[PDB]
């Protein structure tokens, strides 16, 4: 769409009011011209054909309940873009300011969200297991990070490489949640999961075993479900990343924490410089160690903590 950039206002899934970047041309569209080649949000109108219609609104006010998921998808994509740019100096997912597209109201009662290789897609949930998935900034950022990984390391979606890919998305989804200071935690999906139950979440990075995911290499899942446990075995890496940041003692191994920022610098470097499509956990450890070495010196504490953390989860 060609038009005039403007700012609209609406309310997101959780009922919070926020301003969003729109474009005016007869209608007001969810098209943000302020970031790279643009952020565009589409209405999939409960169907599965994509992307759907670019979101159009008559008055630039988005307070209808049907508007909620669009407002958050649009807004959270902006935040995520900002995170990457400000923090890592990366312009969009491709490093070249590619447009970010998202569709909402995908299908009926769809309890999931995903990056399909070209764009983001968000279900509305069934209202019991989930509410519209774009209401979770960690979910939005987890999905957009899959695009970053696809353009960089290219980790295949299966077995260990796949679990690495998933862990990378949870790590950065959490870093973005802290960046925006939106009631941050080390849990994944807490804001849109089981609206009826408080205190739970989809996955825990601080304690993956809380929900039955492995927190040690010896406990990894070796079967075929979930593409070889990409969403299960990610727990091992997640735990490592939490320990590097926060510190702790895990299975008797003590880790001094070096904080979130360094965690992000180290993982971003590993991802973008050292990982390859078929990298395995042992390779990830070597990558993370080399990255910290690069950034902080081989005799640094940083390097030391990365080592301890992988030792703690049993990754050699
Ligand atoms: Ca309106
Ligand atoms: Ca949170
Ligand atoms: Ca979270
Ligand atoms: Ca819940
Ligand atoms: Zn994922
Ligand atoms: Zn996935």
Curated annotation (Swiss-Prot):
Positions of Ca(2+) 4 binding: 193-194, 197, 200
Cofactor: record remark: Binds 4 Ca(2+) ions per subunit.
Co-factor requirement: Ca(2+); Zn(2+)
Keyword Signal: yes
Positions that bind Zn(2+): 142, 146, 166
Keyword check for Zinc: yes
GO BP term, example: proteolysis
Enzyme active site: 143, 231 (proton donor)
Cell compartment(s), UniProt: Secreted
Recorded catalytic activity of this chain's protein: Preferential cleavage: Xaa-|-Leu > Xaa-|-Phe
Cellular component terms per the entry's GO annotation: extracellular region
Binding-site residues, Ca(2+) 1: 57, 59, 61
Temperature dependence: Thermostable.
GO-annotated molecular function: metal ion binding; metalloendopeptidase activity
Superkingdom field: Bacteria
Residues reported in the UniProt entry to bind Ca(2+) 2: 138, 177, 185, 187, 190
Assigned keywords, A-Z: Calcium, Hydrolase, Metal-binding, Metalloprotease, Protease, Secreted, Signal, Zinc, Zymogen
Binding annotation for Ca(2+) 3: 177, 183, 185, 190
Similarity comment text for this entry: Belongs to the peptidase M4 family.
Role played: Extracellular zinc metalloprotease.
Protein name listed in UniProt: Thermolysin
